[PDB]
């Protein structure tokens, strides 16, 4: 069965690491961190890896139940919640995953809305929702152990023991004390435990090559900044590769970024078997390309193929 990519333009793609549209292609060759994100991870033959799951609505979302308000030396109001699988079934910590699928894969203050619909009931249940922040770098962020902490501006109107949803929206802050680093993984089981079942790190092997990302800009609750989240493949590629399950015939698929109005190839890239792109580019920053362009699968090559410079 032949390998294919979806025919979707940049303006028809979404980020696999946060619920955002793709804004631009992007490179950063001087990146010093190890790139090992856990969402948006899928091999070219369709094996999901890390915490990757198929629902766009599951990315950085949580489902569970608040157990109690908790004391914390930090300002604000703090709540403990158990976390289940996204479909509501209990999370099995013995499963071969780093954490419940969809768990955020980066260090930061993730901003969103906690909402609740009571189980007890004109026989209709009570509801509430409030802005909330989850600090994924905190020792209380232990989703692989089945529970996390979130905090609210609201000081009273969160109910214990009731079904709870976290809808992610953006970041609370990216200032110098906000610990935002998109390439630093959370410790899914806490500070004395090793992360397990991780999707592997990704890097260019060929000299002169760098990773190519699908970049989205992420909203902020306040403060200064222009934070972005870079994913290795958009969520629609994850979904396509999973459905097609096409055998990888070499370690590298050659792909070309095509302008369909004119038929010209703007650049070529290596699509690696583990699910990421490299290009021969010596510049950092966005790629200037029309959003009607798209990646086209051209051939299976090997790791020694020399890319045309970008």
Ligand X SMILES: C[C@H](CCC(=O)NCC(=O)O)[C@H]1CC[C@H]2[C@@H]3[C@H](O)C[C@@H]4C[C@H](O)CC[C@]4(C)[C@H]3CC[C@]12C
Residues that bind a second copy (CB under 8 A): 6-8, 11-14, 19-21, 54-58, 86-87, 111, 113, 115, 117, 122, 124-129, 131, 165, 167, 169-170, 217, 219-226, 235-236, 239, 243, 291
Which partner from the list ligand X, Na ion, a second copy, none does 185 bind, CB cut-off 5 to 8 Å by kind?
Answer: none
**Is residue 105 near Na ion by the rule CB under 5 A?**
yes
Q: Which residue has the tokens 């959370």?
A: 186
User: Applying CB under 5 A, which part among 33-41, 120-128, 224-232, 295-303 lies near Na ion?
Assistant: 33-41
Minimum distance between the CB of residue 185 and a second copy, rounded to whole angstroms? 24
Nearest CA to 238 out of 76, 40, 104 is that of 40
Minimum distance between the CB of residue 229 and Na ion, rounded to whole angstroms? 12
Asked whether the beta carbons of 302 and 250 are under 8 A apart, the reply is yes
Residues 40 and 231: their CA atoms lie apart, in Å, by 7
- Whichever of 105 and 230 has its CB closer to Na ion, that residue is 105
- Whichever of 13 and 135 has its CB closer to a second copy, that residue is 13
Which partner from the list a second copy, ligand X, Na ion, none does 25 bind, CB cut-off 5 to 8 Å by kind?
Answer: none
Asked whether the beta carbons of 42 and 101 are under 8 A apart, the reply is no
Q: Phi and psi dihedrals of 96, rounded to 5?
A: -80, 60
Burial of 93 (0-12, 13-18, 19+ CB in 10 A): middle
User: Within 13 Å and on the Cβ side, how many CA atoms surround 65?
Assistant: 11
Q: Binding residues for ligand X, per CB under 6 A?
A: 72, 74-76, 109, 133, 135, 138, 151, 153, 172
């Amino acid at each position: 069965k032949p390998f294919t990519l979806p025919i979707l333009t940049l303006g028809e793609l979404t980020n696999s690491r946060f619920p955002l549209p793709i804004d631009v292609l992007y490179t950063n060759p001087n990146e010093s961190a190890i790139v090992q994100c856990q969402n948006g991870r899928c091999t070219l033959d369709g094996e999901l890896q890390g915490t990757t799951q198929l629902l766009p609505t599951g990315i950085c979302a949580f489902r569970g139940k608040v157990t109690q308000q908790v004391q914390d030396e930090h300002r604000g109001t703090h709540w403990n919640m158990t976390v289940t699988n996204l479909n509501g079934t209990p999370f099995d910590p013995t499963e071969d995953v780093p954490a419940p699928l969809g768990t955020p894969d980066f260090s930061g203050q993730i901003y969103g809305v906690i909402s609740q619909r009571n189980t007890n009931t004109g026989n209709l249940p009570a509801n509430r929702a409030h802005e909330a922040v989850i600090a994924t770098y905190s020792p209380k962020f232990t989703p692989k152990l089945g529970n996390i902490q979130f905090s609210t501006w609201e000081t009273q109107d969160v109910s214990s023991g009731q079904p709870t949803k976290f809808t992610p929206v953006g970041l609370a802050s990216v200032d110098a004390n906000s610990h935002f680093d998109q390439w630093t993984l959370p410790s899914y089981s806490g500070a004395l435990t090793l992360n397990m079942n991780l999707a592997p790190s990704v890097a260019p092997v060929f000299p002169g090559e760098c990773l190519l990302f699908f970049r989205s800009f992420i909203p902020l609750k306040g403060g200064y900044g222009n934070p972005a989240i870079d994913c290795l493949m958009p969520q629609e590629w994850v979904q396509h590769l999973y459905q097609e399950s096409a055998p990888s015939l070499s370690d590298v698929a050659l792909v070309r970024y095509v302008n369909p109005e004119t038929g010209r190839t703007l650049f070529e890239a290596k699509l690696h078997r583990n699910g990421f792109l490299t290009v021969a580019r010596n510049s950092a920053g966005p790629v200037v390309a029309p959003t009607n362009g798209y990646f086209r699968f051209d051939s299976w090559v090997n790791q020694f193929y020399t890319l045309a410079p970008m």
